[PDB]
């Protein structure tokens, strides 16, 4: 089916670096230069207050919609990733259901400004106080802290490309039918990432990357806060939440 489902040579690993970085540039959603340029565009006290005055359900809706948009880009990334379309449909769905949110959280560090602790949201930069109406302050602060810790690594676009490819192709995901196929693909993508860090003298970050339990904790918290919201506003979720968002976080 695919060359990266078997042991890959150094030249084939070099070819895998290029390919993963190409798939990412093509599906990265927002260009880093545009995100960096927008950093001086920060929501005012008045705009912050307006966001805080929004209803909990209006805020959950807007956030679910912006997350779905990001996820759609991660689906395109997966589809362009070498070996992913060669896996069976069950496995592709298993992989994206467990890892789409994890990839989005990692990608988000590009949109996070460590200098003033703000995130790009709806055209401007705002702090965690912008999301106060959601009623999930622990989750928001955990996401900001995570983005802060990734920003301290000074991740390049190519590093984000190779790391997120790895977050997605995880052969430990429960429900994978072609486990050995995913393991070999995971191994080659690990080699591709580690090769690129070796080549750029960036191996010092290996020990600084978050544990898998960190991204799993964040995704578990997201799922738990959505269940709490759903109990409060069931018809909002049923009528106004994106179908893709519901397929991934509330079982349909």
């Amino acid at each position: 089916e695919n060359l990266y489902f078997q042991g890959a040579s150094l030249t084939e690993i070099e070819h895998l670096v290029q390919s993963v970085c190409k798939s990412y540039r093509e599906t990265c959603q927002l260009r880093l230069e545009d995100l960096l340029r927008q950093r001086s565009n920060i929501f005012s006290r008045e705009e912050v207050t307006g966001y805080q005055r929004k209803s909990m359900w209006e805020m959950w809706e807007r956030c679910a919609h912006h997350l779905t948009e990001a996820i759609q880009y991660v689906v395109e990334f997966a589809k362009r990733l070498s070996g992913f379309m060669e896996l069976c449909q069950n496995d592709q769905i298993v992989l994206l259901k467990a890892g789409a949110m994890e990839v989005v959280l990692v990608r988000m560090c590009r949109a996070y400004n460590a200098d003033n602790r703000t995130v790009f949201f709806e055209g401007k930069y705002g702090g965690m106080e912008l999301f106060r109406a959601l009623g999930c302050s622990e989750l928001i602060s955990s996401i900001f802290d995570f983005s802060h810790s990734l920003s301290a690594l000074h991740f390049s676009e190519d590093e984000i490309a190779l790391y997120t490819a790895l977050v997605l192709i995880n052969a430990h995901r429960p429900g994978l039918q072609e486990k050995r196929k995913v393991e070999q693909l995971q191994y080659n993508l690990e080699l591709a990432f580690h090769h690129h860090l070796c080549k750029t003298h960036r191996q010092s970050i290996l020990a600084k990357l978050p544990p898998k339990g960190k991204l799993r904790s964040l995704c578990s918290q997201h799922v738990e806060r959505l269940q709490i919201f759903q109990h409060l506003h069931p018809i909002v979720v049923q009528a106004a939440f994106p179908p893709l968002y519901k397929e991934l976080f509330s079982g349909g």
């Binding site: 689906v75 589809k79 592709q92 769905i93 893709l244 991934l248 349909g252």
Partner: peptide, 12 residues
Amino acid sequence: KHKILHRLLQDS
């Protein structure tokens, strides 16, 4: 019972 992933995965 929403299933959108299979549609996105099949769309070329």
